[PDB]
């Protein structure tokens, strides 16, 4: 550990450092493993001494320090790729950089089955009802909150019945047991201290959870599986597919959902950057980090990364630097970009040339009957019955998108829950609060200054 | 049979009995019964009606707690005491480190408040003291000419002999602090009390359980506010071994030997477990950033960030750590395999600081002219660290005012003289006018104090937000019954000074949540000085303040910040009862992309107050003194078009201030000022804007 | 004083801070005093170095050397405040501040008149014109002006009178005083090095000392001079008294010397 060779004084930490290399070579086959590299090299102005160029060095000698005939291999992991020197990314000194990333809910359940192994989970417990919302928690942080709720079932016994001995009763241990309410205040304990890093992960839903533009939808599907099915094809032809597709429209219409779903056709990783972050990297800027996601991304193969809000940055640096480091054409990765945002009329011009994000699709709102397919796919969302058709809530909301139906369905059953628990010691009526409410808080008028633009392609 | 927790109620040989647990040994209120000891102890205390705690769990002193010398919090029986004696003739002798040099005969005149009227069950040997005049006198009783438990009677004398006894290290000490008299955050210390408490309870559970311990507990926060003497505390209260680790005395020494320092101490604290090792001020350890000019306090770092996990995990010992800011410390330490979970005490809100008044009310022999509520008032932004100090300047004015100037001195220090003098109240004021805004003035976090019932009108938005902050914390399974999420954005707009402040400390004080008050300058002064980190950290400290709400108004001052929020909002705190107000009044200003849903879009706006409104705001702004009622209210909100309740208030100040200027311009009362506040010439009452909030309504519709 | 502090080798310079410490902790009650904390306690990296880090660390916690039965006591001086660390100014390791700042015109008359004590001047001159122009000046200033007052005037006697020998001449620097002239002379070198920085002030203007104008009188009296009498009777009617007043206006209206005979006449600075 790097600590380590910062414990003593320089030049005895590097023959520590050397014999322990020998002896690791006198073990052979042997691994060798060194984390915080960072702390070890780091090349900006931290440099206010020599002793750590000292530690680098021999370090990159003894990566050239087998000549194929010691069987050893170094295992480095520090956390953050930019922020060691080129000079540990050497070829031939460091080759295979690989990332481990955030576990996806599917990751995350399975983290709890194996650490309940041993604490013996009750009979009420499903561990699913944990691993839906831990996102921005990492396992470490589960398996701390898995340690301390085994504490908070143990504050439960061996004071509150005074068994208390000095060796400690295993039966009474094997016979304890972990509730749901220890659970939940196990989640209450501060666990956020793992970070708001973008998440890495294989997506579930497909279009069988959402309901429109069907015909996009099949012209997607064919641009992101006939490239990935028959690339041979492309070679009898001899020319690349082009991996940019524009989204512009009303927001708030699923843009994310049907990301979500083209990169489930391919079973890819979801990677969604958007607006804010990246905007905050750049006041601090930090083009390294946009740089670092997007190659990250190209070894999270396959990928498809959504991005939204270009209107934020299409009025700046951000699409400049973007755009000149979106051009590692690695389209045989199967990595997919796309662009989506509100107003298409502000983007630069820059974009609309070949070799980069190309196609110009009008996304528009969702129509009556793909709403009645998305609130059908959203029973799990939110139950609806057939007293009243959802077609019948389509009567004259068509200038509605799916955020806006969601928002309304959601104040909907705001009231049913409000008026359920109004009772002092379930549909239709919510619905038809719902449809008495006369709110349009909805941009209706940019249908005509989509439709310009949409007849400026023609 | 019965365990120990700690008690309010400082009055010694008082057991606080929760009700059901009277009539399994058969005790009564007046009477006072035997308890079980490690190395066959008894304490005698009389039973207090206190049946909120446990039948098992009863608060106890912790003056008692060092009377059992148990190492604290163990399960001990009761035993009924039919047997109860008053008798005479009782030899009361105190100890010597006690005395700080009090002259001569001290018995009586300490004994006699203490032992007339109380009746106090006294056993042989045991150890109690009084407080007052920052030194009183601890007592124990030598010898019983009744049995061996005892009780106080009117007729028992003692002989006053002068001599105190020699100290045992067998006690516990009276200056060594303990829970009651830490009074900063009392859900907070409880989380910091049962955060590491079981290795000070059995340090052979993890010598024999595989769940690993909560390693390292970290303070960061107000600058010194008591986090030390926090540590030396819980360290009291599990009587286990501690030894303080000075931050700057590991860069008191030259290179290498401070490593050998640092290091040897850590592995005496090895050697001597049980115990929990404390490092003050880590931002003078860790500052790691470029300002780390050289490298030997790289090596610094090292050796803390090897024993960390030098820690050999079978070795069971904790290290406590604090300091000022959080993100001032190198960023290596906050993940796990390093210090665990960390939280800040905060400064302390108005009750907390009364009770650190009332922990420094016992030490100070104090007249009952003065009542500290009012320096419970405006100790706002002031650390009870600056509090004590406080305390001890007017302790020093009052043994300034007088004894300095009565001059019974030449060599002779009489403290019972300094004990019948008392600190009175422009003492007080005057201790108050010395250097007490020495304390940084940030953003206060707060349980609050102004109810429900101080704000009147807008009742079904007040229903709105009564669902709101409430049914998801009450019902978040009903919620999630229907498949749905709650919401956390809320959205307050309108003219201003209409009270939407004031419903604020009311929307958390009615559901018991926390109150953190975030307002637009102070953010436009991180923005301008880019220090963003600590606008992500009030908010990420604002999060592990739960259950909170966080209450932000003007945000139409944004531009950076609007973006930040849209990114620590997007990690919200779901499970964590917090609720997060977007309150404004120039709303058409701020960019539309906020108020889409997933984000704060529950759009309700917050009109001007009605004339039965006004009525209840005027009555609220009328209920901080007694004001008689021969004016009616309804007239007071008859010609109010489009007063607010900051004019409201503004009104009210001036009839106050012409009340008070013809009160005091006398040669050496309500409804002319009344009158002269409604038909004076000002009406200043910004028209223009209802209708374009209502435009604003019509453009939402 | 922190310049031979810092001065010696490493190592030794805690021992000279040992010395310093407890040389006089066996001789309660005593005084220590560690001048210009801006030279020898700022937090920089303009330090480039440790030597530095490591004499004010254990500074800041062996001046705890008070066990609570000891009596050393620290007095604090240096520049600006703001440069000194913070945490060597946390509570504890130091708890409380005063400004000493720069002395008054007020001021300037009676340390004019206790600085010439023994200079022996005469009854030409009258000592309140000489502090007048002299403000945005220390007193060390007024000192090194009385000082080379005397020089001037002991200048121009006992060499051109050639009165120089080995042994001094009592009398005639006795029969000799300072006057006007030769604090003109005092005045007309570079006295201003004390730089023009704020300055607090008793004010003395008091034609319109009680108030405005009409009514703004009866505001203004009150504003600024009932709560230091009568604090508890703005909360026995109900609420606190106000925070701050607007002035506006036509400007050079004396609003400027208005506010100066406000804080004369509440007796306040
Ligand atoms: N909430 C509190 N409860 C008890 N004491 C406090 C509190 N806040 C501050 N203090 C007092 O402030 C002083 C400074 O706190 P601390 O930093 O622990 O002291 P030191 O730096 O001298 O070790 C302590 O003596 C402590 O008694």
């Not at chain 1, 990159?60 to 320090?65: A, V």
């Not at chain 1, 958007?274 to 740089?291: C, D, H, I, Q, Y």
């Not at chain 2, 609007?562 to 309150?583: C, H, P, R, W, Y």
Request: aromatic residues 6%.
């Amino acid at each position: 550990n790097g600590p380590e060779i910062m414990s003593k004084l320089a030049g005895e930490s590097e023959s520590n450092l050397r014999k322990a290399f020998e002896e690791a070579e006198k073990n052979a086959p042997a691994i060798i493993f060194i984390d915080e590299l960072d702390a070890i090299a780091p090349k900006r102005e931290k440099t206010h001494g020599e002793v750590e160029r000292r530690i680098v060095s021999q370090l990159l000698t003894l990566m050239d320090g087998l000549k194929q005939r010691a069987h050893v291999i170094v295992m480095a992991a520090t956390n953050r790729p930019n922020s060691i020197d080129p000079a540990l990314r050497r070829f031939g000194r460091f080759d295979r950089e690989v990332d481990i990333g955030i576990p996806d809910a599917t990751g995350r359940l399975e983290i709890l089955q194996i650490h309940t192994k041993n604490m013996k989970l009750a009979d009420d417990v499903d561990l699913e009802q944990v691993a839906n919302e831990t996102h921005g928690h990492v396992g470490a942080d589960l398996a701390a909150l898995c340690s301390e709720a085994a504490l908070q079932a143990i504050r439960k016994k061996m004071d509150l019945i005074d068994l208390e001995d000095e060796t400690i009763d295993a039966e009474v241990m094997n016979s304890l047991a972990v509730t749901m309410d220890d659970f939940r205040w196990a989640l209450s304990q501060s666990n956020p201290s793992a970070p708001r890093e973008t998440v890495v992960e294989v997506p579930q839903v497909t279009w069988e959870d959402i309901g429109g533009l069907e015909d996009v939808k099949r012209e997607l599907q064919e641009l992101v599986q006939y490239p990935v099915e028959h690339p041979d094809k492309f070679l009898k032809f001899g020319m690349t597919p082009s991996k940019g597709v524009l989204f512009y429209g009303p927001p708030g219409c699923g843009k994310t959902l049907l990301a979500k779903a083209i990169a489930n056709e391919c079973q890819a990783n979801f990677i969604s950057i958007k607006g804010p972050e990246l905007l905050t990297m750049w006041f601090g800027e930090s083009e390294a980090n946009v740089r670092e996601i997007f190659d990250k991304a190209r070894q999270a193969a396959p990928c498809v990364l959504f991005f939204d809000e270009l209107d934020s940055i299409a009025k700046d640096r951000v699409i400049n630097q973007i755009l000149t480091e979106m051009d590692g054409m690695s389209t045989k990765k199967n990595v997919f970009i796309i662009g989506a945002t509100n107003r298409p009329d502000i983007i630069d011009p820059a974009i609309l040339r070949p070799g980069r994000l190309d196609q110009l699709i009008y996304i528009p709102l969702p129509d009556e009957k793909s709403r009645v397919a998305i609130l059908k796919a959203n029973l799990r969302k939110s139950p609806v019955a057939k007293d009243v058709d959802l077609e019948f809530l389509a009567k004259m909301t068509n200038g509605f998108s799916g955020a806006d139906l969601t928002e309304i369905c959601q104040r909907a059953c705001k009231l049913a829950i409000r008026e359920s628990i109004e009772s002092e010691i379930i549909r239709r009526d919510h619905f038809e609060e719902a449809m008495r409410f006369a709110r349009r808080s909805v941009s209706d008028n940019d249908i005509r200054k989509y439709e310009m633009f949409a007849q400026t392609l023609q | 049979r019965l365990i120990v927790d700690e008690a309010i109620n400082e009055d010694n040989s008082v057991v606080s009995l929760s009700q059901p647990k009277m009539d399994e040994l058969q005790l009564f209120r007046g009477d006072t019964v035997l308890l079980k000891g490690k190395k066959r102890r008894e304490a005698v205390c009389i039973v207090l009606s206190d049946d909120t705690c446990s039948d098992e769990k009863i608060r106890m002193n912790r003056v008692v707690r060092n009377n059992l010398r148990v190492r604290l919090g163990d399960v001990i029986s009761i035993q009924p005491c039919p047997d109860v004696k008053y008798g005479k003739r009782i030899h009361v002798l105190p100890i010597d480190d006690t005395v700080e040099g009090i002259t001569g005969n001290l018995f009586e005149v300490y004994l006699k408040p203490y032992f007339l009227e109380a009746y106090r069950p006294i056993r042989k040997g045991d150890i109690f003291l009084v407080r007052g005049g920052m030194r009183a006198v601890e007592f124990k009783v030598v010898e019983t000419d009744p049995s061996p438990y005892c009780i106080v009677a009117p007729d028992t004398v003692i002989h006053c002999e002068g001599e105190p006894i020699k100290r045992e290290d067998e006690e516990e000490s009276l200056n060594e602090v303990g829970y009651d008299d830490i009074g900063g955050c009392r859900k907070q210390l409880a989380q910091i009390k049962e955060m590491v408490e079981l290795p000070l309870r059995h340090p052979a559970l993890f010598k024999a359980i595989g769940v690993k311990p909560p390693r390292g507990i970290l303070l960061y926060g107000p600058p010194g506010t008591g986090k030390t003497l926090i540590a030396r505390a819980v360290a009291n209260e599990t009587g286990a071994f501690f030894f303080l680790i000075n931050g700057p005395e590991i860069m008191s020494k030259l290179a290498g030997e401070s490593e050998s320092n640092l290091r040897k101490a850590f592995e005496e604290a090895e050697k001597n477990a049980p115990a929990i090792i404390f490092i003050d001020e880590l931002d003078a350890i860790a500052p790691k950033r470029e300002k780390t000019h050289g490298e030997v306090e790289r090596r610094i770092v090292s050796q803390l960030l090897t024993l960390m996990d030098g820690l050999k995990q079978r070795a069971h010992v904790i290290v406590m750590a604090a300091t000022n800011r959080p993100n001032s410390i190198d960023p290596a330490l906050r993940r796990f395999g390093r210090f665990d979970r960390e939280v800040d005490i905060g400064i302390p809100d108005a009750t907390g600081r009364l009770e650190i008044l009332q922990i420094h009310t016992k030490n100070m022999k104090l007249a009952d002219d003065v009542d500290l509520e009012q320096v419970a008032n405006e100790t706002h932004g002031h650390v009870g660290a600056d509090l004590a100090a406080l305390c001890s300047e007017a302790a020093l004015q009052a043994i300034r005012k007088k004894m300095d100037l009565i001059d019974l001195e030449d060599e002779t220090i009489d403290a019972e003289v300094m004990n019948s003098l008392a600190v009175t109240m422009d003492d007080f004021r005057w201790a108050l006018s010395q250097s007490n805004p020495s304390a940084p003035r940030e953003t206060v976090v707060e349980v609050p104090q102004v109810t429900w019932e101080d704000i009147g009108g807008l009742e079904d938005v007040k229903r709105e937000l009564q669902e709101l902050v409430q049914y998801p914390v009450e019902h978040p399974d009903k919620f999630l019954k229907f498949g749905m999420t709650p919401s956390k954005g809320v959205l307050f707009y309108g003219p201003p000074g209409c009270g939407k402040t004031l419903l604020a400390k009311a929307i958390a004080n009615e559901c018991q949540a926390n109150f953190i008050s975030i307002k637009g300058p102070e953010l436009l002064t991180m923005w301008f000085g880019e220090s963003e980190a600590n606008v992500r950290e009030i908010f990420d400290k604002a999060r592990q303040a739960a259950p909170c709400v966080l209450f932000f108004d003007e945000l139409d001052s944004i531009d950076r910040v609007i973006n930040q929020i849209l990114t620590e909002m997007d990690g919200m705190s779901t499970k964590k009862n917090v609720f997060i107000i977007g309150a404004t009044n120039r709303p058409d200003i701020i960019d539309p992309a906020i108020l889409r849903p997933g984000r704060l879009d529950q759009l309700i706006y917050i009109p001007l107050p009605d004339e039965k409104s006004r009525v209840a705001i005027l009555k609220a702004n009328l209920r901080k003194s007694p004001v008689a009622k021969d004016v009616d209210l309804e007239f007071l909100a008859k010609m109010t078009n489009g007063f607010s309740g900051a004019d409201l208030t503004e009104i009210c100040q001036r009839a106050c201030k012409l009340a008070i200027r013809e009160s005091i311009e006398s040669e050496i009362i309500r409804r002319d000022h009344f009158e002269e506040a409604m038909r004076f010439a000002r009406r200043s009452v910004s028209d223009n804007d209802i209708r374009k909030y209502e435009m604003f309504a019509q453009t939402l519709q």
